[PDB]
Design a protein around this nucleic acid. Structure first.
Ligand SMILES: Nc1ncnc2c1ncn2[C@@H]1O[C@H](COP(=O)(O)OP(=O)(O)NP(=O)(O)O)[C@@H](O)[C@H]1O
Ligand SMILES: [Mg+2]
Length: 427
RNA sequence: UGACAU
């Protein structure tokens, strides 16, 4: 599978964004916690951030006029050469918070690219937990570095290895990857970490949990990796449990911690709604909710890949043109599904947790948790697919006491923190 | 369970 080439249409490159919403200016009022030694002062605006002219021009081309809180803090921190753990709610601009200052530094303090005997030595490694998120960050990096000499490349599974490998072999300043395909190329001597200036873990708490930690260790402790005191390490997420924050410390050097509001809190721009249903009732309740919301774009989350295929078939055999995305689908199908949803061709996407984190989709009207997740953090990520950049969103969650009772204390906390209604069955 | 190379 060779994915469709990245669009070189400038308009399309900068169009890939969610226009800021009615509550964007309200971001200003959120309390920001900063801890660690000698934090730089936050920047007041993109124009007063000591950026290079055409990096600023690209920010402005992207449609941005005012930096979000995470950006106000992260930009000067990164430009000062410091390590950073950055926490901010879903849809509040964490991607640009690291891309903009990194790209600025790659241009203001330029280093010639190295690629010897086919082995690329990227200056920036960005990793994320899923293939579609990795492609998204890649496309955002292309946006902010547009028209510059910087070369961005992508690496992720389910794709023709040679296609991605030959592209990487040409040399790249920034490599955005999922861990599996990254280490594949590293072990073939297609990629070395010898020129790394920045390592970024996006969805960092997920990258540091049990599933991904070995792959992170293999990167951070790779024989070719430049040591932690001679590079920068940046970590961003909407969630960060304290035990995972502790684990993060092994890969960080005298770092600053930035939390925009309560760590792991839900975006207050998402209206959170719950419906008490039995496992049986879920099917009709989903059908009813879709009928009542004709013309709305809905993202339906389920627990298993089996149920993702079932629900997709149910909603298709019923009414709407619907797509499905999960790990047992072909990578072409996963990308076609997401694009169909992102373009408007399809207004329903059925998804597993593969689509819970990071993905930036225009006008998600409703996020439905057909199955609630087992983790409150993942709940917060899922509902954050809507209500982004100051726009209002809606999440409707099906609650089954037989399956979801253990989550009640954590849900009630999340709702109370976000000033949402707590229904009687979650008290 | 669900992500994550060949
Ligand atoms: N300063 C800004 N002004 C206007 N729009 C912005 C700004 N910064 C980012 N955006 C847009 O806001 C959307 C959300 O950005 P993104 O970096 O995906 O948020 P995030 O905090 O990483 N979300 P998540 O990964 O779900 O926790 C994107 O469409 C950006 O293009
Ligand atoms: Mg993000």
């Amino acid at each position: 599978y060779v994915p469709p080439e990245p669009t070189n249409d400038e308009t399309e490159i900068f169009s890939s964004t969610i226009s800021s919403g009615i509550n964007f200016d309200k971001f200003d009022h959120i309390a920001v916690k900063v801890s660690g030694e000698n934090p730089p002062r936050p920047i007041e605006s993109f124009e007063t951030a000591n950026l290079r002219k055409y990096v600023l021009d690209n920010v402005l081309k992207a449609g941005y006029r005012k930096p979000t809180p995470i950006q106000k803090n992260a930009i000067p921190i990164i430009m000062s050469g410091r390590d950073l753990m950055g926490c901010a709610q879903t849809g509040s601009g964490k991607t640009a918070a690291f891309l903009v200052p990194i790209i600025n530094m790659l241009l203001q303090d330029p280093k010639d690219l190295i690629s010897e005997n086919g082995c690329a030595q990227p200056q920036v490694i960005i990793v994320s937990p899923t293939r579609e998120l990795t492609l998204q960050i890649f496309n955002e990096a292309r946006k902010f570095s547009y028209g510059s000499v910087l070369k961005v490349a992508v690496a992720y599974g389910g794709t023709a290895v040679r296609h991605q490998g030959d592209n990487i072999a040409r040399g790249c300043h920034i490599l955005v990857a999922t861990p599996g395909r990254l280490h594949d190329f590293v072990e073939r001597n297609r990629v070395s970490f010898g020129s790394v200036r920045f390592v970024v873990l996006d969805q960092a708490d997920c990258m540091l949990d049990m599933g991904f930690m070995p792959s992170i260790e293999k990167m951070m402790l790779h024989p070719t990796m430049v040591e932690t005191t001679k590079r920068q390490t940046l970590m961003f997420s909407a969630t960060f449990p304290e035990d995972i924050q502790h684990l993060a410390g092994r890969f960080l050097n005298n770092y600053l911690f930035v939390a925009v509001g309560i760590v792991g809190g839900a975006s207050t721009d998402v209206e959170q709604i719950f419906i008490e249903v039995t496992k049986y009732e879920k099917r009709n309740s989903l059908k009813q909710l879709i009928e009542e919301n004709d013309g709305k774009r809905i993202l339906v989350f389920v627990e298993t890949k089996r149920n993702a295929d079932f629900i997709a078939a149910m909603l298709s055999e019923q009414q709407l043109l619907t797509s499905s995305i999960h790990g047992d689908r072909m990578q072409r199908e996963r990308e076609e599904a997401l694009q169909n949803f992102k373009s408007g061709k399809h207004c329903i996407l059925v998804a597993t947790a593969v689509a819970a984190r990071g993905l930036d989709i225009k006008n998600v009207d409703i996020v439905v948790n057909y199955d609630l997740p087992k983790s409150i953090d993942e709940y917060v990520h899922r509902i954050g697919r809507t209500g982004r950049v100051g726009n209002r969103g809606k999440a409707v969650s099906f609650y089954d006491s037989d399956q979801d009772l253990a989550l009640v204390a954590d849900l009630s906390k999340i709702l109370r923190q976000a000033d949402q209604s707590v229904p009687d069955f979650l008290k």
